């Protein structure tokens, strides 16, 4: 399978500029073998959270060839587990071997491939390392929830983000959770006896400021606390629901960069081999 | 009485290269 | 060595069709033959039955 | 008996399957059989103990 | 850059029919 996004007539002063797009991904809506350029298109920058919400319902595809007539592509992941392709870094950060890649909408805007001939423009989304897109998305959703090099939020769909966050956070509260909460003093006194434990707890940990302000009595034994046990259930819920927390907020990883012969790192704006996962 | 239908199999596994690259 | 190996396991696995036919013959001839004891009188009183 | 039962042999199939770099053939041959004679045509003794 | 050494493999698995019939 290969997607054929047909192109209208374009300006020779701009067709050539669009030929410089060989490793940027685009977001279709359905996977029919043929399609049109007028279809895969987004307006200029705005509402980064709206954009990242848009990048989850529509599976993406990477382009490979740009001839003056057609433009091939490849559905990113629909059945492939090792389908090796190429895509170029278009983010501000570099990327080393091995690490997974994530797709996040373009920040600050102003990166729009304007096509005055077809009157339509695109926004090829950037590619970041995983662990850093995590920080980016976390910062954006925290600042959006604050509303009861920075774009202004919208307060319209930010409530979707706040809701999706607060739901997963609330469903962490189980009758066993308070049993784990009844040791904050017992934890802190352990933190100050070993260097590693003290390094684990951060500085603005927002709980270290609780261990010295409030006291809690022994926790009341729950109902039928003589057959089952709530600590293990609580922790299983925690791990199962945290292993995917960032996914339902940010974007799932889609590919990991592999390089067999080339230099270890790829600087920004250079093609890099990759395997999709 | 020993040569090429398993030495058959053996040489011309050859005309199979795509095993396509597409999902 | 690998070729001798093939020739040998070849000549080792599939004629167990000959042995296997020899087996199936008995396995079928057994499940349809009543014992002589229950059959010697059965033919003697034949005709006058029912 | 001189011809106790018919018997039909098939043509041998050769099933394929891969298994982790070690492969394994699977031969197969279908058969059939009907007892040709009418009435019992095979005895049985149970000689020894 | 897509055609016949896995489309190699693919066509001519062909010259293998005995995989003998004999044990």
UniProtKB/TrEMBL annotation, chain A:
Keywords: Capsid protein, Host nucleus, Virion. Pfam families: Herpes_V23. The keyword Mitochondrion does not apply. One of its GO terms (molecular function) is structural molecule activity. Transmembrane segments: none annotated. HAMAP family: HSV_TRX2. This is Capsid triplex subunit 2. It comes from Suid herpesvirus 1 (SuHV-1). The lineage of its organism: Viruses, Duplodnaviria, Heunggongvirae, Peploviricota, Herviviricetes.
UniProtKB/TrEMBL annotation, chains B, E:
Coiled coil: none annotated. It comes from the Viruses. This is Capsid triplex subunit 1. It comes from Suid herpesvirus 1 (SuHV-1). The gene is CP(UL38).
UniProtKB/TrEMBL annotation, chain D:
It comes from the Viruses. This is Major capsid protein.
